[model samples]
Target: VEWTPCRPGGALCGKLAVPVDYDRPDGDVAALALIRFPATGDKIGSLVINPGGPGESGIEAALGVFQTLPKRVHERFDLVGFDPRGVASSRPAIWCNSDADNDRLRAEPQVDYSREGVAHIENETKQFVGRCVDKMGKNFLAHVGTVNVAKDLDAIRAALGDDKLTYLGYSYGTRIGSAYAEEFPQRVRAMILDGAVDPNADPIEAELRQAKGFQDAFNNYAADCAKNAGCPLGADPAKAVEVYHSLVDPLVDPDNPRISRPARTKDPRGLSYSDAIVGTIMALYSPNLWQHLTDGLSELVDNRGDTLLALADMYMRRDSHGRYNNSGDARVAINCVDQPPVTDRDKVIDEDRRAREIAPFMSYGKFTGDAPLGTCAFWPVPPTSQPHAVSAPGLVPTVVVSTTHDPATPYKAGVDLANQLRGSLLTFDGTQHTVVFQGDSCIDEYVTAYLIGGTTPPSGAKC
Candidate 1:
């Protein structure tokens, strides 16, 4: 209940003590870190927000990004954020190993879906899970799924002294909203979920769909880059895709160390093509980050890799000095607990081939980077929940936003989730991953009105 200065507007940082296992509320407890930007003078209630990842820090989302929100939103209510169980800033947090070991996971060659590659990946996965269990504990991994997160949200709601939950979630955070609505229907007052995750999708289908989405994003990027004469992707998207693939390969090829091709054949960069792809895909999630992609590409073409390395570092959450956080490790841990592992090697190889046919640059470009089951197949604990439709039989209306051309979390997922929840849809025809306050005035205004005035958007309202 104590608060300290966080900003000029009197934001505060604190924690909420809750049981690690909700079923045993009196057992071992973990403090969920909370950041609150108190509403300016006139507050309606608390609005909790999550930026997804099953691992991304929600505390920073509130403290850092809350100011960009509309003034009306800032004036109407306090913005609250919390790191769910086993996430950053929370007790008994998930950590597998040191930054050096984790960096090797990306610094090394990416698994190309070959028989031997699959075997190597599975072995690494088993070792990772073993390390996590040995370092953290099997008990901690056993309780890190979405269901516990839902219960944690209810706990947070009560701790905030709010009878009803008002939430805004992006990407995986939508799972939190959907699960919360299902488990505590009566507790929801307002919710806005952008980049919605369909609760009904199994892990296999999710892998393929997400791969396809990223491929489409690549196609869009290649097509757009092809328009400019100075763009290295060239004039034809089909040919540009092939050309771009060639460009990415040499960046990671260990034996073929050529940083700049057809100009100088010396290597001065250390970025692996695997990390180059990771950096590109991460930036492709939003058109706003397209400039970063272009700059990264230019750096890669200029016998320098600083720009590309910087993007990859951001994607991996690795700092300039080789220091890294545990977000990726936590992400894999949450995924393992959330869904069943894709263990069939043959089926995965087939999917990779199909993905190449559709978008070759993504599935087979440099590494078969589609949802690596390496970490999940050897998970210490089996999944606790299966994919299923999430619906509240009797609940107030909620809002769901979807972008037509999202790189992650396909558009159909939003449609399916909205239908599942029986909520309103705010569609945006764009390439950005999430469409809340990332520059779409229409989406932001609609969300503001719905959340502040309790006005449900008409069915099929789109931007």
Candidate 2:
């Protein structure tokens, strides 16, 4: 581990060598990228952190969060973040589509639920999976699951010279954190899991619930939007959902382009029906982005899609240069190998139908046919992990922070995770996705105290 200055942040950056597959210690190894912001005062230990996505750049996350944390946190521990295997800045990064391919895919028209349309989408998804398998190789994808990530976390801890692990994980990061706890219960010094993923949820059910969570977040956004004068969604909070439907549902109309009003942008590749929805979902993640959502919706009223397309680009991690990151590829690769896929076509279709019912805003429109199977169905690797309640008995008192109306990882997920891990739950009454160290003094104080001195918030404590 030779640490040097990162290209951008003043923090130290390096790489750690770990076996691609823990089962074969003598096999091929992967170089995992790591970044660190040294403590400003006497360092206690390293605090390893991840910002969800299962694909998000932990190195970038470390750079982003260094200043957001309290002074004491920066003073006491070295803040470290790493790109798990196949993630950004890590050697042998996952790459499925080229920049042009990703652009075309994003601009592609939405497929209806009709049989022919569904079949067309299935073929497209099949080709996508084929590209991934061809590029990443089957063996690499097989070893990128959460268990390997947990193992890698241990490797990182030992390399950093930390006797016990100190971690702060958000969203899907909580999965890695919890898995590590289960595998190395005795190694935990302190841990904080915010916006947790429910370990017991079946993959399909989890996706559906997440869709519903986004829907709930949209409703909350709409209620707030209704408060402002000349609200695009109108003044009535009760009718805001309908108003939202009225705004974007036209994009799905097959008969009339103008009536459906597929959003047009300055970029020749105008906003597709799918991009509009993706952008909306992305904005719903945080109240901080609510104004942008409102502005985007207002632009939709003028049939312009610039803001929405930009927001969609942000969600896809596409830069102004039109290049793409491997987050999308890694997300699919890791998740497909972590959870079992539903191969039954009818079951997949049924789940889609139920999801639309649960989150009407997510629906493209009513149609007469089947829904296509996702990329997971064609995954080359068998799942390495299964959905089950994680057990970490005798582990330290960890802190689990959850928000009331998170758009991705719902509140109940945190509740369930805290129960399963036997940790303390710190509830925040808000509509954001994750609520630690993002301007909430109460949440920050609780997490800081826990990490610094092994303090656990009181049971049923809330912010």
Candidate 3:
């Protein structure tokens, strides 16, 4: 592997070659890309940073985060980011839906009302996975899961000559870090997990829980919206539910619920049933975006899709030029291989009914379209990494941050992960996907202190 400076050239970049299967080290190999923004202050050690997404590019994520880090953090540590195997800037990066394809996919007409809609979705998923397999091939799909990612993490740590890894992982990264701790506890000097994934969670249970979490966020948003003078859902929170029904009911019905057209005219911005939920879900990730969401709701009331389309674009990482960064495709591929596959239909039906009961608002046409059978349901391979409760008692105190109202990963997951590892917990009281270094000085301080000085806050710490 050769090291080269990434152009415009402030950081060092390289690709590390690793076996496709660790179980068979001499077999096929894949190159994992690495980038480093050298420590700006008094150097402590290299700190690996990962921003959730199961598929988010750490190189870009880190580049985005580098300036926001405290001086202590930068000055005392080398901040490193890498595109995990099968991710962007890495070898054989998976690419699936193009912007046009995505638009068409989300805009696919409902066929079954309940009957035609699901039938089409299942068919779409099948073709999508089949195309992925045919294009990406078994060798590419065969090697890109979290276990391989964790192995790559260790290889980078050792190659950097760090005695032990110092890591800060958010969202899905927590799962990676937790897996690392289990696999290499002795190699970890300090680890900070924020917006943790519960190592003990089941795939189906995890889905339902996240749906519930999102529903909670939806209700919270509605309650807040109702208090505002011009809230689109009106002054009654209940009206938000009605508004939700109005927006989604017709699309899935062979019969339009009321004012919904056979399909709303496609906005040039490309908002569809998928865009509406995707944008709304993205908004739920942070209260800082609530005003935007409020406006999105207001726009939704007028039967507009542009507001949400923009938000969905943000969520999907779609550029103005209409090219995607490939994170969504990576997410689908990586997640499909990371957990148990959902190939059965009964489970999808069961999930639909339960999701409607607990998260009725999200139970719109798009909701049912995605539930039960995930993109993974039709994958060509099985899960390479399985979920299990992690325990790393031998490591230094690991700090876990849990947001009380995180809609994606959920707060309890943080608690569970922290408890599983016998680590300290930091409770953030707000709505955000990954809170640390996201403008909460309190969290920044805890994280900065922990990473830079190894000062773990007392157990049950709250911010």
Candidate 4:
């Protein structure tokens, strides 16, 4: 691997060819895209970071993390970020749909749970999975799971000439770190698994918890709004949920669950019910963006959805030119191969019912009828990993950060992961997703001390 100036001679870009299948070491390889921001002062080692999306561009994430991290940390360690297999800038990228196809798909309204609707979605999912397999080879899809990505991380550590790994993983990246810890326990020097995904959570359980987490975040947002003047949810926090339903329930009315009158946008592409939901979740990840959510809902007053659509586009990584970054495509490819899919219609319906019961915010339409088989059910590759407790007995003391009102990854999942890994848990009492060096002085100090000197924070540390 050779590094070249990729960004005005600041961040260097590089690539590492790793086996597509670790089982077949001599077989096909994937050129993993990597970026590194060198240390300002004397460098101790590489401090690798992973931004959470199962399909997010790690190269882009490194740029952001490098700028956001404390100077002390950056001056002491070279910050590195790598795109996992099938992600952006990597050869033979996982691609399933074109920009127009994705735009059409995103604009499509939510399907009803009637027999016909269920069948419609099932067929669509089957077609989508087939398209994925056709575009990204079945062999590549089979090896894009977290287990293989963890192996690739070790290969990266070795290539960096680091004796031990020093990693910071967020959200879905925490899953990758946990996988690596369990697989290469002795190779770990320091780690931070922020906004963790519980290894023991099955697909159904994970969705249910995520739904509840988002609901909690929304509730927190509404409560904060109630304390402010001219709030979207009104002055009464007690009726916030009701007000929320009044605002968005029109998208999937019970009378016509399948057909929705989308919120009009400035452009031809109006905000669909699906985009609205996704955009709302995107804002809930960080409190700093909560104002945008409020502003977007305010736009709903005029039946305009420009802000929401913009937020949705940001979440989906859709550029202004209508091109997507293939994050969604890679996400499906990796997730489908990582977890066992539940194909039984009845079981899926039962789980969805449980989800609605726990998180009524998402229970907009009638989905109690026949349920559609998920895309993962039609995925060509068998799952390489299953939900189970992780054990990394020989691993060094690590940090696990969790926000109390995180929207995507629940707080309890972080607690459980910290307990399972026997790592130090930093509990943040806030409404955000992952928090480490995002301008929180206490967290930055604690995490920086840990990363630089391997000094774990005090027991029961909370911020």
lDDT by residue (122-234, candidate 1, tens digit) is 67777887789998888778888988899989988988889999999999999989989999999999999999999898766676788888888988887888886677677
Better of 1 and 2 by lDDT: 2
Per-residue accuracy of model 3 over 321-353 as CA lDDT, tens digit each: 777887888899988888787667778777777
List clashing residue pairs in candidate 1.
252-273
Give lDDT for model 3. 0.79
lDDT of 4 by residue, 1-463 (tens): 6999894327888899999989899999889998988889998899998997889988888887776889899899989999998899987699998898788778766657778777777877877888887887789889999989999999999999899999999989999999999999899989999898998877787888888899888888989988988897899988877777677766654576677678888778887777887888889888888899999888876677888888999999999988899999999888888888888777898887787777776666555656667788888889999988988888888899988888888899999999999989899989999988788888999999999989998988998
Model 2, 321-411: lDDT tens digits are: 8889999989989888888888998788889889878998778667344888888888878999998988888899898899999879989
RMSD vs true structure, all candidates: 3.2, 1.7, 2.8, 1.5
Question: What's the TM-score of every candidate structure?
Answer: 0.93, 0.97, 0.92, 0.97
User: Regarding lDDT, does 2 or 4 come out ahead?
Assistant: 2
Q: Which ten residues in a row are the worst by lDDT in model 4? A: 361-370
lDDT of each: 0.79, 0.87, 0.79, 0.86
* Residue 360 in candidate 4, Cα distance off native in Å: 1.8
Which segments of candidate 4 are over 4 A away from where they belong? 7-9, 252-255
Clashes by residue pair, model 2: 250-260
Q: Clash totals for all models, in order? A: 1, 1, 7, 0
lDDT of 1 at 233: 72
